[PDB]
Paper text:
Many NLR proteins nucleate the “inflammasome”—a large macromolecular complex that triggers inflammatory cell death and cytokine secretion in response to microbial or danger-associated ligands. Like many other supramolecular assemblies in the human innate immune system, the inflammasome complex relies on homotypic and heterotypic interactions between the death domains (DDs) to initiate, amplify, and propagate pyroptotic signaling. Inflammasome sensor NLRs can be grouped into two categories based on their DDs: PYRIN domain (PYD) and caspase activation and recruitment domain (CARD), both domains were found to form filamentous complexes to initiate the inflammasome formation. Extending this analysis, we also found that specific type II interface motifs directly dictate the compatibility of heterotypic pairwise CARD-CARD interactions among NLRP1, CARD8, NLRC4, ASC, and CASP1.
To test this, we first identified the Type II interfaces in published ASC-CARD and CASP1-CARD filament structures. In both structures, we noted a similar internal density bridge on Type II interface as what was observed in NLRP1-CARD and CARD8-CARD complexes (compare Fig. 5a), which had not been highlighted by previous analyses. In ASC-CARD filaments, this bridge consists of two residues Gln185 and Tyr187, which extend from the Type IIb surface and interact with Ala168 and Asn170 on the Type IIa surface. In addition, the tyrosine residue (Tyr187) on ASC-CARD Type IIb demonstrate a more inwards orientation as compared to the equivalent tyrosine residue on CARD8 type IIb surface (Tyr527), thus allowing it to effectively engage both its own Type IIa as well as that of CASP1-CARD.
Numbering used by the authors:
A (entry chain L), B (entry chain D), C (entry chain K), D (entry chain H), E (entry chain J), F (entry chain G), ...: 112 to 194
The structure:
């Protein structure tokens, strides 16, 4: 949404389930080379940064898909930042 | 509580009942992949470190849940660090 | 099939007989170094990810072989995802 | 097309898959010295500028080829700027 | 062959056994500094790009050797692109 | 402040948390192209130089924001140079 | 505007986003030969002087366009010099 | 102290209790991202190098804290280098 | 010998007793940091590659030592490649 | 030789081991400022042109030295252009 | 001093820490445009020549400051040329 | 010594223990920014080239120290090139 880009610096630090979001987004948005490129950089925030590297090329129609994925996996930190 | 993050270095070394706390937190907070990921690393404190890897994504409504679980299982070490 | 790549995210989580599939595919498709490389990463889905790392190099003639192996081992989760 | 030169300032900023366009266009249009020359300038838009340096030497028959490449790789940002 | 330069963009993406080709080509063609330089860049296609950087310095008498090595390791993807 | 430009040569050498300051300053002052341009130049002070390249374009109303960010992350080196 | 020529010596020194202004003014005002000619002279103010070399061939109808570009990119240094 | 920087090359090789010092220094000096960044690099001295990467930003008031932690854990190698 | 560098690609794959050769070479040739660095990378050939990383710095006087160690441990694969 | 100046246009494009030729020629012919000056211009042929800038100051007695260096490193592209 | 202009040709070739001398002299003597202008010309001595372009506009009261900077950074090449 | 500059091209290729030489030379000769700058460029000889970039700034009194370090760590390649 605009919630993703609005709360960018907070979602960099408190998300700990990248490995599942990658499988949720595979095929639909992220190509394979980017999927392999994200699986590196052991520092966990770096996976988030490298993931947000492909955010500027997204329209309003798929950031919503990622927000649904976050609402299926966590659904608590989403509510934590919403409140 | 704030007691959990306040007394981290003491709770890493002196908690010896991970195998039950994992069952207390299952379904409610911990997903299945993280649950399988904790059951490794034979060094007993390392399971505690892997558990605290998921602490930053916790709100005030579930750290209390974990302290309740510790007051049901141990209830003396909780009192030992409280005093 | 195209069913293997179509239901990838579901097959990552619910297949629990990797140690036999590896023996089914040995000699025919997987070389020895890859076979030794898969037997690591205690987190059970990670073996599945390491297995799908070698999938892009598969044609229509061997993915069918893997679906045959799954129909010999599980044959219920295959039936569970087909329905 | 004329869409490439019409939306230049938008395509400079929102394209994040240059490393694949180079291989799609290799041999057909871009010589090798240009291919090695693009793989520099870490600032990602700078690869786009260095690529548009070779646009004036293109006819109507190959800018269409590049639009096909974008419709095969992204096909969403293309649709985002079309609408 | 000329098959190597003919199917460059396809061979960038679908080859997953670089770690063995390196040992096949060592001593005969590739010097040691290039051998150490290839063992980097975790993105798997980048190893392929850095490898094809040394392709222009090859005559007709050694690309045949590399195709033989590819026919000894995979022997299916060679057949997959041949058909 | 005037403290930022007053102690420039000391702050070039002893700051080790650039990757977080960028996320604190993102959206508000630094555009995205500069953000991508800073994540280069492995020599750690060079990130500081490239960051101070955009300092002359700052008024009194945002250097205060950067000093607040330094007082939230480090809060000791700020205190170390103040004393 | 007349603000541009009124504050010439201040806008020579404190503008750090030439690389975007060029893309804002491209096609509308600046021809391509000047666009390539400005991208030289590593000293950043020299790009500004070379840009103001083309100010005399501008009417009241396009300096306004450039001030709009500065109000979209920076919008703070403009406000800093206005006050 | 000055003893930490004076005997740097000796403390790189003979300290084998990083996993505990990290918990001793957590919250007080090391932020979370650096704590996650140290827990990598299987080569045991590399954790020491990555830890000393954050040493130049320390005043006299916390290097003493680290020497106290070393005197509580080891208390023999400190005495070994002192004598 | 020259047999070590001559049969490199065969010795990468068929030696399965690294943990003993390391003890044979300790103190005499390998320093301790390299010894710790080799005991990683679970894929068994990777220990061989990391071991041959230190081969170019060997004279004729110690590669013979390694061949004697292999003739004490294996003495069949040595004979298998000799014949 | 006269082969160097005779096959200049072929040796500009297909030589990919400049970084070693520099060390082969160091001390004997190239001064230090030229040695540092060649290590720039990421485009690989540009190092070749900057290298041939110093060819006119060479007699018949050192172009032979460079041909010897090329026959020691590559010895196949030399053979490829000889035939 | 007069030592700077007396040993100019020796200080052109053997100084390897320009990037710090610039920060030592910044604000006091060097303006910002000269600071940006020196940071070019990859050939390391060229930064030294461009630096000595501004020596003629210096009195006896600041060449002493620059010699102090050299005695704080190197203090050996100063000592090497003094002896 | 003069042995260091005489056998430069041989010491570029056959030394594999840079990570220890850096700690031997730290504080005494190499400043910290150069120390951080050397720990890059994954190609093992490139660390050596970046190291010899600072060699011209060494007198007869410290190259001896570096040869002592080489005789303490390796003491075999030193003897190998001496003979």
């Amino acid at each position: 949404l605009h919630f993703i880009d609005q709360h960018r610096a907070a979602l960099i630090a408190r998300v700990t389930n990248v490995e599942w979001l990658l499988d949720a987004l595979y095929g639909k948005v992220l190509t394979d080379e980017q999927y392999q490129a994200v699986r590196a950089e052991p520092t966990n925030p770096s996976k988030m940064r490298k993931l947000f590297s492909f955010t500027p090329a997204w329209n309003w129609t798929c950031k919503d898909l990622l927000l649904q994925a976050l609402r299926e996996s966590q659904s608590y930190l989403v509510e934590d930042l919403e409140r």
